[PDB]
């Protein structure tokens with residue numbers, strides 16, 4: 001390796017990220033004054049639990065679809081065997097979304113951009129999972145305090161996804177090599193932009209714990225509403241989480 | 243399976 005080759009990886013990951021975002025950062029910034037009214041909030045709160053679940057799982061699934069496209073443009077990803085591509089996406093895609101959502105989060109009033117306006121965590125009360133919701137919102141507040149650039153999110157999310165410790169990987173060496181090259185590229189970029197102080201502040205088990213809390217909450221919902229899950233949750237969502 | 247298709251297409 002050499003610096004040019006590492007810096008090429010950085011630019012390639014940032015571009016892949018840019019083309020697979022879904023919502024552009026400037027779009028999200030320009031809507032920050034567009035906040036749900038007390039009555040719109042109340043409207044969300046009065047929705048049935050099963051309806052709120054279906055809507056949320058829909059938007060999450062759409063988000064995950066963009067993560068898949070990001071993966072497919074990640075240098076090295078498509079050269080892994082398909083078994084390993086799937087392992088990495090099953091364990092990683094939700095973690096990616098949870099990192100990517102800090103872009104849509106306004107830490108000044110603790111709201112998130114959801115179905116066209118910003119709203120507070122109380123918007124999601126009808127879900128019945130205040131503890132998970134609260135921890136997601138805190139997680140995003142933590143990440144917002146770092147002031148991630150778009151390049152930092154790109155590189156960090158690549159590393160969330162390319163993790164050679166995922167159980168089930170058939171060629172764990174090949175993934176380790178990819179991961180180490182991505183780690184070098186991220187750290188290189190931080191060293192060049194005088195941002196190495198963030199290394200210390202990145203989250204620890206934390207991403208894992210949020211994804212676990214998601215899955216245990218789903219098993220409770222599907223036990224109480226199994227036909228709703230069968231008939232009205234997206235196929236992709238069930239494939240990743242059920 | 244959906245994943246298979248998204249990865250192939």
Ligand SMILES: CC(C)=CCC[C@@](C)(O)[C@H]1CC[C@]2(C)[C@@H]1[C@H](O)C[C@@H]1[C@@]3(C)CC[C@H](O)C(C)(C)[C@@H]3[C@@H](O)C[C@]12C
Pocket residue numbers: 053056057059060063097098100101104112113114124127129132133136213214215217218
């Ligand atoms: C109820 C349950 C266990 C699962 C379904 C709901 C939850 C708990 O897992 C809850 C957890 C928090 C939750 C509301 C989520 C929804 O499904 C998906 C959304 C979005 C990804 C949808 C799209 C938007 O573009 C953005 C701003 C990125 C949203 C995120 O800001 C918030 C998020 C992740």
